[PDB]
Amino acid sequence: HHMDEEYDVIVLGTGLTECILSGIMSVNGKKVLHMDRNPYYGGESSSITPLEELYKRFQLLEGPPETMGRGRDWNVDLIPKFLMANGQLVKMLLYTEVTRYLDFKVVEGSFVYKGGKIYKVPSTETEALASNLMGMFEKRRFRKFLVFVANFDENDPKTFEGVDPQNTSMRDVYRKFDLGQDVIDFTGHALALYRTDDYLDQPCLETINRIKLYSESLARYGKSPYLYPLYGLGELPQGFARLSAIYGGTYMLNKPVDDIIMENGKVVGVKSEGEVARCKQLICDPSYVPDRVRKAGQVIRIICILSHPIKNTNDANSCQIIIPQNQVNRKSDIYVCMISYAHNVAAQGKYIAIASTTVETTDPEKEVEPALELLEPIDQKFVAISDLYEPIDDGSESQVFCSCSYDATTHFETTCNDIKDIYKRMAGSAFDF
Numbered sequence: 001h002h003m004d005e006e007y008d009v010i011v012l013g014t015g016l017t018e019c020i021l022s023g024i025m026s027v028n029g030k031k032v033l034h035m036d037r038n039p040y041y042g043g044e045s046s047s048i049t050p051l052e053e054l055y056k057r058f059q060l061l062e063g064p065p066e067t068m069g070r071g072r073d074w075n076v077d078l079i080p081k082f083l084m085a086n087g088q089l090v091k092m093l094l095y096t097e098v099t100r101y102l103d104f105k106v107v108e109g110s111f112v113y114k115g116g117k118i119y120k121v122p123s124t125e126t127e128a129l130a131s132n133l134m135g136m137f138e139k140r141r142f143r144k145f146l147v148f149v150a151n152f153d154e155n156d157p158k159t160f161e162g163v164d165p166q167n168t169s170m171r172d173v174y175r176k177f178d179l180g181q182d183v184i185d186f187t188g189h190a191l192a193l194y195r196t197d198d199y200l201d202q203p204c205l206e207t208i209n210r211i212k213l214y215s216e217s218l219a220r221y222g223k224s225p226y227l228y229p230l231y232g233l234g235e236l237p238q239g240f241a242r243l244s245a246i247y248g249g250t251y252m253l254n255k256p257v258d259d260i261i262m263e264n265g266k267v268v269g270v271k272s273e274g275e276v277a278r279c280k281q282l283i284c285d286p287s288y289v290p291d292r293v294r295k296a297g298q299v300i301r302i303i304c305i306l307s308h309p310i311k312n313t314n315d316a317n318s319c320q321i322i323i324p325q326n327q328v329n330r331k332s333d334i335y336v337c338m339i340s341y342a343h344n345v346a347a348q349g350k351y352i353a354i355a356s357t358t359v360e361t362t363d364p365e366k367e368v369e370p371a372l373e374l375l376e377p378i379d380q381k382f383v384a385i386s387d388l389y390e391p392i393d394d395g396s397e398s399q400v401f402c403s404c405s406y407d408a409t410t411h412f413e414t415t416c417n418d419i420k421d422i423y424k425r426m427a428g429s430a431f432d433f
């Protein structure tokens with residue numbers, strides 16, 4: 001196999017982040033070379049099919065029992081994550097036009113864990129007044145809070161109600177409406193989607209806007225604010241590969257990167273199969289540049305096949321479940337996202353619940369018991385522990401732009417920030433929406 005002599009950009013790995021940036025570059029008029037050492041797409045975030053392959057990958061010789069249904073009807077994302085309907089990730093996908101090859105379907109339910117139980121996340125005043133997460137009085141205070149958020153307008157100080165969006169902290173905003181720890185817990189982690197409570201002592205603007213984003217997405221799609229493509233996220237690598245051909249430049253799989261040639265601290269090309277191709281910029285995931293990354297931790301994901309909808313979700317065919325750390329004596333949230341035959345990722349009557357979190361103990365599996373208890377009985381489990389990496393070089397000089405490994409969250413918030421960041425580092429300016 002052979003490469004060209006020169007490309008403006010060379011991308012290594014076909015993970016979601018690489019694919020999306022690769023799409024932007026191509027659409028922006030650059031000659032792109034995109035390759036992957038693997039014989040499949042998505043790298044770490046690959047989708048597995050048929051079911052038999054999933055069993056193989058997890059060392060389950062027995063193979064799936066007939067009761068698992070038609071193997072070919074299974075498309076299992078190793079790292080499933082949902083997209084915020086009105087989010088920027090979706091907007092970036094529209095920009096590349098890869099959306100032309102995707103069928104987004106709204107996730108049926110969104111829940112939050114509390115006191116050992118899961119409740120519907122209340123985003124509307126109506127949902128608030130009917131929520132069992134709070135008592136009669138507090139839920140009414142929360143209702144007024146949502147009112148303020150809904151009516152809030154960044155450019156109209158009359159709606160600020162005396163708060164300084166650029167200076168008044170969210171903690172102060174919470175006090176203003178007299179909201180307790182439990183309400184703050186699900187609002188911050190299940191509505192604003194933060195991973196930690198650092199936002200409490202930061203300007204309220206961002207948080208208010210995040211809650212607005214959730215509400216607006218929900219209002220637009222009805223069931224929840226989350227989207228997931230039919231057939232799983234594996235449809236993205238395929239879409240971008242197809243988009244790639246359009247602008248000339250087909251994705252090359254099963255192609256080894258023998259070396260990343262650096263000249264005076266700056267990349268100038270890549271060598272593969274006794275051949276060299278020059279490039280001005282290089283995009284890749286951590287696995288291609290061990291010396292330009294540091295380990296930021298470990299994540300554990302447990303894929304659980306079920307034959308029944310998750311209890312207490314009103315038989316949702318798909319759902320997001322956030323388990324705030326404070327609710328389970330942890331320093332990191334636990335997540336559970338589930339998709340099923342409704343999104344064409346599993347055989348009829350089957351559901352795929354994937355529980356995840358950041359490792360904090362020597363018994364990672366035990367750490368996720370709080371989430372598994374919400375899923376039993378479980379037909380089969382698939383446990384995977386992954387090391388997380390983040391670049392120690394922003395490519396400013398090297399012109400080598402590495403992405404971060406995918407964290408435990410079950411939505412694209414943090415992945416979107418990485419993409420936007422990497423892009424800014426490459427273009428010199430922020431992606432203009």
Ligand SMILES: C/C=C(\C)CC/C=C(\C)CC/C=C(\C)CCC=C(C)C
Pocket residue numbers: 027028095096097432433
């Ligand atoms: C006010 C500045 C804005 C809105 C910047 C964002 C620019 C966009 C959304 C379009 C400019 C790009 C083109 C005219 C051509 C590239 C082709 C595609 C993105 C299909």
